[PDB]
Curated annotation (Swiss-Prot), chain A:
Segment of the intact protein contained: 102 to 193 of 198
Subunit structure: Component of the chloroplast large ribosomal subunit (LSU). Mature 70S chloroplast ribosomes of higher plants consist of a small (30S) and a large (50S) subunit. The 30S small subunit contains 1 molecule of ribosomal RNA (16S rRNA) and 24 different proteins. The 50S large subunit contains 3 rRNA molecules (23S, 5S and 4.5S rRNA) and 33 different proteins.
Top-level division of the source organism's lineage: Eukaryota
Localisation per UniProt entry: Plastid, Chloroplast
Additional facts recorded: Two forms of the protein exist; they have the same N-terminal sequence and approximately the same molecular weight.
Protein name per its UniProtKB record: Large ribosomal subunit protein uL23c
Family per similarity comment: Belongs to the universal ribosomal protein uL23 family.
Source species of the chain: Spinacia oleracea
Curated annotation (Swiss-Prot), chain B:
Residues of the full protein shown: 51 to 174 of 192
Keyword Membrane: no
GO molecular function: rRNA binding; structural constituent of ribosome
Protein name: Large ribosomal subunit protein uL24c
Compartments reported by the entry: Plastid, Chloroplast
Gene: RPL24
Swiss-Prot record, chain C:
GO biological process: one example: translation
Whole-protein coverage range: 72 to 145 of 148
Protein name: Large ribosomal subunit protein bL28c
Species this chain originates from: Spinacia oleracea (Spinach)
Primary localisation category: plastid
Location relative to the cell: Plastid, Chloroplast
Swiss-Prot record, chain D:
Signal peptide: none
Protein name, UniProt field: Large ribosomal subunit protein uL29c
A GO cellular component annotation in the UniProt record: chloroplast
Subunit structure: Component of the chloroplast large ribosomal subunit (LSU). Mature 70S chloroplast ribosomes of higher plants consist of a small (30S) and a large (50S) subunit. The 30S small subunit contains 1 molecule of ribosomal RNA (16S rRNA) and 24 different proteins. The 50S large subunit contains 3 rRNA molecules (23S, 5S and 4.5S rRNA) and 33 different proteins.
Biological processes, Gene Ontology terms: translation
UniProtKB keywords: Chloroplast, Plastid, Ribonucleoprotein, Ribosomal protein, Transit peptide
Family: Belongs to the universal ribosomal protein uL29 family.
Gene Ontology terms, MF aspect: structural constituent of ribosome
Major location category of this protein: plastid
Function in brief: Component of the chloroplast ribosome (chloro-ribosome), a dedicated translation machinery responsible for the synthesis of chloroplast genome-encoded proteins, including proteins of the transcription and translation machinery and components of the photosynthetic apparatus.
Organism field: Spinacia oleracea (Spinach)
Gene from which this protein is expressed: RPL29
Localization (cell): Plastid, Chloroplast
Length: 92, 124, 74, 90
RNA sequence: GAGUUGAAAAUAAGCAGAGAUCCGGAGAUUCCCGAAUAGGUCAACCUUUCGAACUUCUGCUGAAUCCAUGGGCAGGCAAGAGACAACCUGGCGAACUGAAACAUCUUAGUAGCCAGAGGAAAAGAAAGCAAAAGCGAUUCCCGUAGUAGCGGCGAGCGAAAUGGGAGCAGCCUAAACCGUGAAAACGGGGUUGUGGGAGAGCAAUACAAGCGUCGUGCUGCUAGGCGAAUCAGUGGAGUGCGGAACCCUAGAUGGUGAAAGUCCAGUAGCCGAAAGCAUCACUAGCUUAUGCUCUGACCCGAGUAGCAUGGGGCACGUGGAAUCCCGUGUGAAUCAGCAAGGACCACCUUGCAAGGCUAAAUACUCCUGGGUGACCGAUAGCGAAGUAGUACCGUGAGGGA
RNA sequence: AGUAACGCAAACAUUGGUGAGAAUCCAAUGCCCCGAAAACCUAAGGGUUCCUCCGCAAGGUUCGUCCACGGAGGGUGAGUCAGGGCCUAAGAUCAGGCCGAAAGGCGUAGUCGAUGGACAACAGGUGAAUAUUCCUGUACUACCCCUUGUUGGUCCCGAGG
RNA sequence: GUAGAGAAAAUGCCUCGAGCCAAUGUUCGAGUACCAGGCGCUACGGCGCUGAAGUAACCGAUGCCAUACUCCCAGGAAAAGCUCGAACGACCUUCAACAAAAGGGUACCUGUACCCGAAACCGACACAGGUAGGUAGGUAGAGAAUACCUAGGGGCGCGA
């Protein structure tokens, strides 16, 4: 059997995007975009929940904790997909 | 103002049982604005107070805008207590108490205890 | 513990008295000594920690009824 | 507004509808973050309806007759394999 | 039965006279830590073969060792762990103090510490008190009584019996004997005291009472419902005052601009439960079971009682020191007996230890639901009427507004 | 009592700017100080003090337009760096085992336990707050797939290191 | 290579190998980078285009070789990773397992700000005190003392 490290309610593993101006800097400059996830999350569970719900090959998943408690995730997509054409569809 | 906040048994506020519904014609019994009829507008169950139309006059001053313009003076009603009002039928002009008649159907309706008509309004 | 499993003999809280009636505590306890007694239902020695009164039972009454009186044999 | 249809639907379409309403709830989180015009009441009855769905599913766990910890092992034995899928509203 | 999405306003959208919000009964979820329990852990995390780990129970396989034991594997809604203010029981157990010092003694078997357990616990059904008269398990209260005593006869400690009340309830088991098995057990019998039981024989049948998933019964509780009777004048406001009326099976209370029988919520009274719990009363049913005569043989709880010692505790400090329980060592008798009646002996009286279980009266408050208060009113009353065991201090125990 | 003091005797001065208000905030020019630091980075600790804007009620031993202060928002990106997914020392906990009024004491296997042993990334740029972490270049680890052979392989055990 | 119960190892015997070891070094990485300068506007805070030489020698490290040698007694951790290997023991077996050769794919949690010879840590203070470790420029000097300075950072939060 292929167990994950922790079973963590995968339709709630992502919470909200970040709409700061530096996030748009990461879109136009990095082909990346910014999500807010819960602390109980992975570079294997978030990375699977982007290539399925969105339909995009994700390059890397750079995560960090934020001292108010919640977790911040810079997800960088592949070169084949612009983050600007996939972020205006959501509302960025 | 902690001396006047709502009491909360099991996180929900204790709501009072009263005798005035919306759309009723109340009379002010004693306090202040004595002896004038009126509809009620908005209801406040925790204070047991009721705001009624076009009688209680509280001329309040409001800073209107954020640009500092026109600063309007708005004349707004306040809360008179629910024990200071009675109900009124427009056929017999007399302020009367309440009563709960159980009619032929299952429903139980209000009743002016001195006259013979029903306070209770249908679905419209 | 300083108890015998067969007969429930424990220590005795019993003061000692000098000539001028001074009393210390002197916890007084039984001679429950190490032995290794033969067992007829297995024809073999068991290693036990027996008080001497319990020794007089297992030689007088036999080890079977004494060990079933305590409840334990293995 | 009575939800009479939930005790009519079988367990597979029940569970698929749970996953669809959770996905629509995540779309309501994206539309709430996007500041597009949204209904917060739908954000209420979405999760509030998934509560109805899991009460009916858990009653169906009850009338077979199994333990609470067997429902823990069965439920967590199911939650480990949920491939994410977007809702059919496109 | 009419508005709601807590405090807590505002804003955006809802939910609702095919009955929302809310209340009550029974259920569901309950991330992570914490008995914490898959393993580790620096609690609320990490690693995961996603696991009730360990002990106990059941089942299989069954080491040194033949039977065993240990181990391993498995099952299991799976019994225990952990928490609990005070009371209760069991064990360790002081010292300051009092004696005008202090060691015997007291404080004190109190505090404290550990363990356990219930709404009560312990004890409890006479090997008992008593005195020639009598009582009939245990517990608690008043009393005897500050008496008899005990005590460097100092300081102090201090019963018990007779009497009066609360509450009452008594039952299972071993042995002698029959039957099955190598014992060990099992099934019948018997469990009592101015003695029974076993063995042998004769009679004789049903009155009364005890226990109880199960469901109809009753009241009570956890939501509630109806519920009597007035206006007007007065300096902000009237419930107060003055004038006119009424209710009362309701004049308890709280509020309402201001103090209320007639304004509201209510109250007196009458009602009301789908669901759960509790109270006693039914029920298929299990049970208790009887009387006489002969028979001193057989039995009536053994390393036990007693004794020599070392003690402890009974108010009794080793004293004439009995009763009760233990440490070492010795070590009985079965009813024609044994133990107690304050060393001990003789007679009489009383009871039958060395096997267990029991409700009530009883002690207390972390509390809960009612009713009160010659109790407080922000230096008071709980430490705490707001963030209260909070800010703050300490490494921590802890202190603390 | 409006008294001592205002926390080294490195030392500031002027011109402009901002404002209602400037010895103190900013900018420039000189002057002066540390320079095995009074420089830069990381271990511990602290916990948001870091950055933009706003404010000057309290704090700053003066003032203040400034602030490690108050309010709102943001910021900490790792296969390679440091720990864990590896290992053990001191030490701790110790299954069974011995002991002990209780609690627990001793002690073996085992398991934790870095201050050590093992293991793979450097240079330039970006940037109000991040850089061996983000971008670009060249690399290196640990597994899978793609081609040749092998029927045995993994772990425990024996040894070198 | 053998020999003994002897797979590896260890010990004993025999044989082949004159070289070996490691900092440093040349090239690629690596220049259509960086860089002095000039060229055009200032929100005058900087951006924009172009770009020369980029070598040699003397000193010389407390850094490497280097757990390299010499000397001494006071005699200098453990286990895993790694490498080699028979029997015994548990499991899986053929397109399964093992060992490589190029080429692609994949990349586990926590810490990452800021102060850290301190105004933010510890001394109740924005306290003349304390705090492990790393980098060690020039001149005069034996020197990490000292005196003055580059980089970088300040003028010590009352003044007259």
């Amino acid at each position: 059997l292929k167990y994950p490290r922790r079973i963590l309610d995968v339709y709630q593993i992502l919470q909200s995007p970040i709409i700061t101006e530096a996030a748009i800097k990461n879109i136009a400059d990095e082909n990346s975009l910014l999500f807010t996830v819960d602390v109980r999350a992975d570079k294997k569970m978030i990375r699977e929940a982007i290539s399925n719900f969105f339909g995009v090959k994700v390059r890397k998943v750079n995560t960090l904790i934020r001292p108010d408690g919640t977790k911040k995730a810079y997800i960088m997509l592949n070169k084949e997909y612009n983050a600007s054409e996939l972020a205006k569809k959501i509302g960025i | 103002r902690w001396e006047r906040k709502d009491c909360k048994p099991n996180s929900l506020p204790k709501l009072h049982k009263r005798h005035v519904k919306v759309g009723d014609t109340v009379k002010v019994i004693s306090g202040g604005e004595k002896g004038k009829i009126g509809e009620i507008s908005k209801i406040h169950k925790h204070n047991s107070t009721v705001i009624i139309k076009d009688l209680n006059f509280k001329t309040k001053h409001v800073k209107s805008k954020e640009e500092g313009e026109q600063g309007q003076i708005i004349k707004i009603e306040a809360a008179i207590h629910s024990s200071n009002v009675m109900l009124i039928l427009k056929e017999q002009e007399v302020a009367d108490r309440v009563g709960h008649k159980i009619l032929e159907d299952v429903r139980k309706v209000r009743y002016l205890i001195k006259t013979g008509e029903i306070v209770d309004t249908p679905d419209r | 513990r300083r108890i015998c499993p067969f007969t429930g003999k424990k220590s005795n809280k019993a003061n000692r008295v000098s000539h001028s009636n001074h009393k210390t505590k002197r916890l007084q306890f039984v001679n429950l000594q190490y032995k290794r007694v033969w067992w007829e239902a297995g024809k073999r020695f068991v290693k036990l920690r027996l008080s001497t009164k319990a020794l007089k039972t297992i030689e007088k009454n036999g080890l079977d009824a004494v060990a079933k009186k305590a409840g334990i044999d293995l | 507004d009575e939800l009479k249809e939930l005790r009519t639907k079988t367990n597979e379409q029940l569970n698929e509808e749970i996953l669809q309403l959770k996905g629509e709830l995540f779309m309501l989180r994206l539309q709430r973050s996007a500041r597009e015009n949204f209904k917060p009441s739908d954000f209420g009855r979405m999760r509030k309806r998934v509560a109805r769905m899991l009460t009916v599913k858990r009653e169906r766990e009850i009338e077979q007759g199994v333990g609470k910890r067997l429902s823990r092992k069965l439920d967590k034995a199911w939650k480990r394999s949920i491939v994410v899928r977007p809702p059919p509203s496109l």
